């Protein structure tokens, strides 16, 4: 509650402390696969979500304290066709009872089913969007991007990101509550490249007192499929008290 | 999984990260009450259990790694009648799907319903037994005690403990896996007294790979009731890898 | 040794756990001032260095283990004249017995006194260079930059950085040893801007087994002076063992 | 300062982050030896002290905040003659500039040189005293003990302790500042035995704002020598802020 820190360097099949929604699963080799894979090939129209079992406490209505946190993970996106990719994944905080919305949720990364932004969603996400289509995703920019989503698919702030096929990406997301700042960074040590972005968000009005952290991913047409994988994931959060 | 640490200095009503079984609840003042209390008075035949939402990983069958951990909490036992008290409470590790056994479970601290020890229980507990009755609890010693229970109410090792009515007790439980040692200590800073005990247990054969940690408490006849309360609770565990 | 973590949210005068070289000092208000300030005005030709008292263990020659670490701090650079600024500061790892080189060390940020790179220096730094002069600093680029220095002032990799006068900057430096990667990030939450850079370095050949971490800063001519301040600083490092 | 945590599972020769006073040293095998050992035999009249390089912040005079901390370590005491042992060792907090007092400091575990208690010492120690002599140590009880020392060799509180020759002991010392309580526990997993003690101390009046943590050990006559060794040592302290005073 006040403080919560965990680290998962490797995953196991049917992991107990992870709640899976959709078709997400963990392979025998120990890699967390949000999209089902048959004989080394990704499938089409596959949506997956994983969450940590324990809800995370963000703020208190009585005292007014608000939590600042930081997390880091390693993920891989590998597509048979480098030219075009489908949708992508995201790291998101949602209500504990959040479930997959009904209907077509591919272009929304399995988080929403409507393009409009509503304050009732109470979802705060950092998306790694690899699909820059204009007809299906008019809101997204022309290039592959890393964006911050607050109660809507239309990201308040995005940064151009150069995706590498079969490349391990080390991502870090840090929220500073006193400064009301969300920072997302991604690093490719294979080419030694960095992409960073920051935004101004206040979790008091957006998210409830208790939330759940996790990952989401989606896929589209069979021709433009891809594989999303997570190898490690570390999280730490503390609820500092304000006497003011 | 590999590492998990949390700290709860204060509790809130309907806490999300705590699973309650029986009649356990959290008061408005922020104290975790395993036994229901009416207008400042404990009730009779009340059994309560609380667990952490996230299961804890102890060991791996493939690598052979085993986790060592440590936890600390503060609890209060306050009875209207200091002469005689009912049952008591315990800090226990059990399977994630553990539920309250049917039948009379008061004298067993809400963990078992049979006096015999069976390896299928897979429950490892540290009990603070305040009831020294001989007819109902022939297994327990003549004095109030702190005991270690492994797959049975009959504690493998117990230490005499002087209970103080309305006294805050600071307890610490530490498991060292390489040495296969479980250590339980209790401190009263109001009188500056300490009671410690150690035992030899191996969680490989007893508990499964994934377990849940928490507290349990029970009460008996109305004349000899008592109030069990928990004010704070901190836990930390790491899964160190063995290359041997 | 194996693990070391500390956090200093506020500083105190004549702090015991900080070793000061040059004219660095801590103000009564609790801000770490590397450059001496008279009545709210910075001085000229002022060089300061601060280090943590405890040396940090990086690697072992026998086992071959190498440490990965992460640190974060907050710093402020405030100059009376926004047009031109002097030198700058840096976060550096050096030998425990490192001292200020003799001679003009202003343009070298108080770390070196020669422009050439020599492997005997054994200094690894992340510099926030605010002086883009060409005659005095031909090696530096045309713009204010954040650079990574390995045994020389000429940074192996630099990133353009927009300096803000009187603006609080939150910086984070993370070294991953298995991937041999050094990452430096800087954030301005007042304007919500981020600047990140990564480089490939191996501390085995560069630094010795035991090093000291800290900060350095320098100033130049009186007309182009500036004030360097540090408000908070957190560091954490672990020495993970490799069984390969 | 506000928070400081470190862990040393193994030691190395000439360790940089440890300050050694006296004849303490680290062996090639990686064990911290406070008393010099020749060819596997302890020596006589050997006094050693080790401290962590970084001073530890306990309290602030302005805000009034006071730090609570916890530490754990593993130590071995092995004597050729189990019948009688010399002096012992202790885990102590002292001023950063503390040095070995001049004169005979064997019976005082290398911390003091006078039996009387003076508030100017500013030393807070947890001693594992293995010498129960009455003529040389009239203050100590009749049995081997674990004691808490505050500005004096005469321990305010002691607990009987059964020493095991060549036995690994796991010790844990925890200070709770809001409750002003110091707790010391020792465990032998080889026989599964525990010895615990608690005392009431306030570091505000005793120790200064900045202190240094470490270990001390001493030896006596050649016939009753022993070897003191430390295998691992972990420390963690945090300075929690109190808004009641402010
Ligand atoms: C992220 O988080 C915080 C907010 O939570 C951001 O805001 C800064 O936080 C600091 C510390 O809380 C605050 O600094 C305050 O500045 C006040 C005014 O500054 C005086 O001193 C300077 C000295 O040069 C003068 O230039 C100036 O003219 C003023 O005279 C001070 O009054 C404050 O002191 C206070 O101390 C205690 C509380 O600790 C109070 O009880 C006192 O009454 C007193 O008021 C304090 O020093 C300030 O809110 C922000 N800093 C600024 C404006 O510089 C952080 O900026 C942000 N951190 C990041 C991004 O790293
Ligand atoms: C809790 O956990 C551990 C077990 O997990 C308990 O067991 C001790 O652990 C240590 C360290 O692993 C082991 O110590 C070993 O002792 C071996 C023999 O000792 C030699 O050296 C002494 C020096 O005085 C001589 O007296 C003696 O005659 C022997 O010559 C050594 O061989 C071991 O060294 C090994 O190092 C590496 C591994 O790190 C190996 O690759 C080498 O091949 C080499 O074998 C090692 O030093 C031993 O298992 C236990 N310690 C003993 C018996 O003293 C801990 O006791 C327990 N900790 C607690 C309760 O605090
Ligand atoms: C930062 O740090 C590490 C290096 O320290 C970087 O390197 C990766 O680290 C991982 C894990 O150590 C290594 O992955 C290895 O890949 C080997 C080959 O891959 C097989 O499996 C895939 C499955 O799709 C096939 O595609 C492929 O064709 C191969 O069949 C495996 O053999 C390795 O498994 C090993 O497991 C144990 C050790 O844990 C060994 O004992 C076994 O013998 C077995 O060899 C292992 O899975 C690999 O070194 C690097 N990953 C790669 C190449 O994908 C990290 O990339 C870097 N992390 C960042 C930047 O986040
Ligand atoms: C180690 O540390 C602390 C001291 O630092 C020791 O002292 C206890 O700490 C708690 C929490 O700070 C304090 O509890 C206080 O008790 C007050 C009175 O109790 C009322 O409620 C009970 C309910 O049964 C009634 O029985 C009783 O008659 C009273 O009606 C309360 O007033 C306090 O509430 C306060 O909350 C906030 C601060 O958080 C204040 O702003 C409010 O004004 C309000 O006063 C509070 O609940 C108390 O100091 C000590 N606990 C006691 C006496 O029970 C710890 O005991 C010690 N911990 C160990 C050894 O584990
Ligand atoms: C886009 O997403 C929204 C939100 O999901 C979606 O609106 C509704 O969401 C709910 C929850 O997923 C859908 O779930 C069920 O649909 C049927 C018919 O309602 C029933 O199984 C359930 O309805 C009963 O239970 C509700 C409990 O709140 C009651 O409110 C209700 O009165 C019924 O008793 C349950 O709602 C629901 O189907 C959709 N609504 C519709 C018309 O489908 C929205 O539909 C999505 N818009 C798209 C894809 O265009
Ligand atoms: C002491 O504790 C043991 C263990 O609880 C207890 O044995 C049985 O435990 C189960 C689980 O709590 C009891 O629960 C239910 O009882 C009835 C009748 O069986 C049904 O609701 C359920 O039985 C069905 O579901 C089971 C699923 O495994 C099937 O195995 C079974 O075939 C049925 O389909 C469920 O079991 C169960 O009642 C008790 N057994 C009895 C006779 O009560 C034991 O009874 C306790 N001994 C005491 C109090 O003396
Ligand atoms: C650029 O930096 C280098 C490295 O500092 C510098 O070379 C020498 O560095 C040392 C250490 O700071 C200087 O320090 C002293 O200088 C005088 C004369 O040597 C003496 O105080 C000392 O010399 C004695 O002690 C040394 C110990 O190693 C002995 O090696 C020596 O034989 C003497 O006994 C000590 O060295 C030293 O002055 C400089 N060398 C010179 C000529 O100044 C180098 O000078 C700098 N280059 C610049 C500014 O152009
Ligand atoms: C028991 O312990 C106390 C405390 O150590 C001891 O008193 C004195 O302690 C100091 C510090 O260890 C001893 O150190 C030196 O002794 C000589 C003579 O004084 C000098 O080297 C030094 O004295 C000079 O420096 C001092 C700095 O404070 C000045 O105060 C002084 O005026 C001198 O300029 C330094 O003190 C000191 O020797 C002892 N005092 C004596 C008489 O030895 C005490 O002696 C011990 N009692 C025993 C063993 O019975
Ligand atoms: C917080 O407390 C105030 C008390 O007036 C109440 O009005 C408000 O509804 C509460 N908000 C939440 C989310 O509980
Ligand atoms: C990264 O390095 C590899 C080396 O083979 C190279 O093939 C690839 O083109 C590089 N990618 C980028 C974006 O530089
Ligand atoms: C552990 O692995 C071995 C492989 O032979 C298997 O026999 C055993 O059943 C496994 N144990 C568990 C609890 O999975
Ligand atoms: C503890 O201290 C209080 C002080 O009032 C006293 O009443 C009580 O008897 C003491 N309890 C024990 C076991 O010493
Ligand atoms: C490391 O060990 C090898 C052993 O052959 C030795 O040659 C080498 O000099 C050592 N390196 C250092 C820096 O001690
Ligand atoms: C940052 O915000 C302030 C608001 O007053 C503005 O003055 C300043 O120009 C901004 N700086 C940048 C680089 O946008
Ligand atoms: C603490 O502050 C007060 C201010 O009046 C002062 O009198 C006292 O000497 C200070 N104590 C210490 C140890 O600095
Ligand atoms: C501890 O166990 C060993 C087993 O050999 C035994 O020799 C020794 O006497 C025991 N010590 C105590 C105090 O029980
Ligand atoms: Ca898209
Ligand atoms: Ca009983
Ligand atoms: Ca420059
Ligand atoms: Ca003695
Ligand atoms: Mn997008
Ligand atoms: Mn019992
Ligand atoms: Mn530069
Ligand atoms: Mn003694």
Tab-separated table of N, CA and C and ligand atoms in Angstrom, chain A residues 129 131 137 140, ligand 17:
chain	number	residue	atom	x	y	z
A	129	UNK	N	3.341	2.763	-30.263
A	129	UNK	CA	2.516	2.547	-31.443
A	129	UNK	C	3.415	2.399	-32.663
A	131	UNK	N	2.023	1.338	-35.709
A	131	UNK	CA	1.161	1.467	-36.880
A	131	UNK	C	0.837	2.943	-37.074
A	137	UNK	N	-6.100	5.002	-38.344
A	137	UNK	CA	-5.613	5.734	-37.174
A	137	UNK	C	-5.339	7.173	-37.591
A	140	UNK	N	-3.234	9.200	-34.934
A	140	UNK	CA	-1.811	8.956	-34.771
A	140	UNK	C	-1.009	9.751	-35.804
E	17	LIG	CA1	-1.418	3.370	-34.596
